[PDB]
Please model this.
Amino acid sequence: SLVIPEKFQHILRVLNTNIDGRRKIAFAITAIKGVGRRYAHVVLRKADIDLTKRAGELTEDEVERVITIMQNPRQYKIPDWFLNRQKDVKDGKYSQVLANGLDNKLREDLERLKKIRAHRGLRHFWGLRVRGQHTKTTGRRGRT
Amino acid sequence: KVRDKLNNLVLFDKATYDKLCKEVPNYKLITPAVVSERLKIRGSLARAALQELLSKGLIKLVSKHRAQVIYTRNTKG
Amino acid sequence: TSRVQPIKLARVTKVLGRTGSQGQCTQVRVEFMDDTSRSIIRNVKGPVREGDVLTLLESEREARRLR
Amino acid sequence: TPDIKLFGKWSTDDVQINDISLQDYIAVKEKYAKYLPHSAGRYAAKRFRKAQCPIVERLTNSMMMHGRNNGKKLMTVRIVKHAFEIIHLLTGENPLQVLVNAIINSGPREDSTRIGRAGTVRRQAVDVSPLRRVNQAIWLLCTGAREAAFRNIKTIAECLADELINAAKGSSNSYAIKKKDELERVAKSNR
Amino acid sequence: LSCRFYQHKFPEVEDVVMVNVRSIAEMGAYVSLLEYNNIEGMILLSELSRRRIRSINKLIRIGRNECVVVIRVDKEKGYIDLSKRRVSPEEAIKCEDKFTKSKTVYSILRHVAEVLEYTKDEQLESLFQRTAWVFDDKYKRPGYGAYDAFKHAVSDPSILDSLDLNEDEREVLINNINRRLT
RNA sequence: ACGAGACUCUGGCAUGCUAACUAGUUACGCGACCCCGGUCGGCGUAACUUCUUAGAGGGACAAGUGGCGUUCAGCCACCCGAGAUUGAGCAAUAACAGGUCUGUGAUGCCCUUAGAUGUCCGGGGCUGCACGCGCGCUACACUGACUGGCUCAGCGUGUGCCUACCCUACGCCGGCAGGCGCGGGUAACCCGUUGAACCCCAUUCGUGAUGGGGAUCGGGGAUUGCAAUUAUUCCCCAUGAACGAGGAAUUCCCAGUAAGUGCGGGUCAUAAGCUUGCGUUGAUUAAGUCCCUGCCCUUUGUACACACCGCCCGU
Model:
């Protein structure tokens, strides 16, 4: 119960990143890049794990259950508007992407914008503010 | 000017549990903050342990609030 | 120092003008209860009136002016 | 049937103000005894009308500072109530007697004012008013509890409780006693 | 872990000391005595210099070591008063010489205790009492009873073996003293 | 004679006067529920102005008392009393090379006037970025963040002239931003008893740049409009930077005041980090001074008078 159980794992290696077991399970997997605070609640709600438990004392069955839920969102009654990548420009399907995939997709998106030589790609290549805000006063630490 | 970086444990081990069971009911003023300061434990663990001893009948409740709870020891006689 | 001066409790009798650079303090004519004959003038800081008792740590000093 | 006015659950009688110079600046006995430290106000209109305010109401009024707490009187009332409960549960004494003793022992009796031109450093020691002693005591205890309860797991309702406990004995482990003794030493250094 | 330098918990009056300033204040400042286990002192604005000042940060310089003389010590409430205005340059040389030799002795013995792996304030107090405070009280020299002790015991083992502290820890401390003070 | 004062508006009160189905109160009857009474902003009609609304009047004048003062102009405190200093509006002579020719079919002179400095359309710029400064918004957390429940206002505005563009109850669809049928209000009638926020109660969090903070950046979906890329605005999911109470210096204020907190109006097809008002919670300090920065009167000195930001001597 309140006494620490046997083989309480201190760290986790979910998707090749260190995840501590001291944080809450609704918030320890937030440190996985691509999954935030709101996305972590739905994954742990479709799967039958209570959110009052800690991260390092859950077992491998429910760990791999929520891991396959995170790599396969849509086949577990998760709606299509809950996804960080909807209607992708290459394959055209709704797919939630994770950390290294997120960096790869952002890198190839910026490469595509620079290749097509749009204004957004040119501003991203120059390293300035691209969303269209005033740069006369704010943004002083860009260079020395 | 000592830093002394804090590491507050989340789950009770063997020794902190029975030192709590031998020292916390012998305290004049019992508060989750002060027992977390004395035993170097996390705040939610302190609240859970004091709720457990409140259910066990070794802790007398005085006042209950959303900001803090105040607990006191029982009489020896 | 080698002197443990006993503290004196003294009662004001009148309020004189307000001295100081910015008028922060005022002068009072204060008298003691253990000897109700000795009366000295003291510079007191704060809101005072006629009737309040002041705790004097020493009783042998006379009130200096603003400078 | 108001025999005595219970301050929540505490009696207002059998309390002693030891300092004779503060007999009419501590309004706790038999006239200014209310059930709650919340009143309508109208004490800061005249020149000496704030001396008739009760000391626990003045403590709740001076408790709320630092921008994000201005106007929140009810929260200061419940923190003061929990602090009084903790003081009674710890020392086994009446919380009004601890608060009154914390006022007397934390009040400075001699202060040095700055004299000279704008830029030079020169002090001159003067004695203080009985009202200003009470005001400095309340301000020092409140800012000591506020500084003690900052970036810490310890709540302010027991930080204020330990503030009044240490000030009532003069143990010099509190902020208010230390600042009082600092002011006394600076005043005594150049009399 | 840190331990105090000398057996006196508070310094005597009119004693020189190397002080690091912690923070500037309004009426005074807050400082820390290095050779008395980092207790909070106070330096005054009127105790800075006899002449006029045009910059308070020109001579205070929070984050820098300063030599001050003790003025008033109250052991009952832990109140320390310091004065930089009365400090003469004649004793200043002896001041940082004593401070450097005391801090090198403290560093060597702290390294020896860290090798011995004892983390307790009472344990450091007991071992440092067995090592340095005993011969300091024997020779009757505050600060001067340690550097000369290690200088005379680097080449003589019989002088170092007179202390009945331990055997293995004593040999480790003797080797650490002979390795450094050569 | 002007200025001040006097005057005008508003706030604070009168169980007395005048009247309220576009505002209510109290009795009576019907109706619903609970265990003989209680609740109903459910329904309706016998008096009334206690709430609300707004008109005439009343009330405060240093009036009474005690001290200080030539016992004159006045000052201090107290009793009875809703008030014994509410807040604003208006505001004299003399001038400033103060700002406005970009408010004007107010205007002298000068320039241009058909390849126009008039006018109109299309595109762009007014946002552009090694840097500096000013007014501001959000934070640095546990007097706190998140998640539910409970509960309380006042100023306003609202279907437009050539002028097209109003505020919205109710029912359905969709997580949300939103979309479609139906009705009301030219307004104490409808939105609306304006179920506002801050607060209060109860979980989760535990001193960790952390569930603080939300900058930067990617994808998708709606609305306005002829047109949004240099992202109009909003919504959803990711990304999670600096920032640990701020150096020299400096601004504003003393009573329902500062501060915290939200709501209206102005710009508005789309629209507030600005301004102007409104209400809620609600303090610490002070009834003084001329030290700093300045102001009013008198005396004195002056080689200054576009007036000390003056004048003026020598190598």
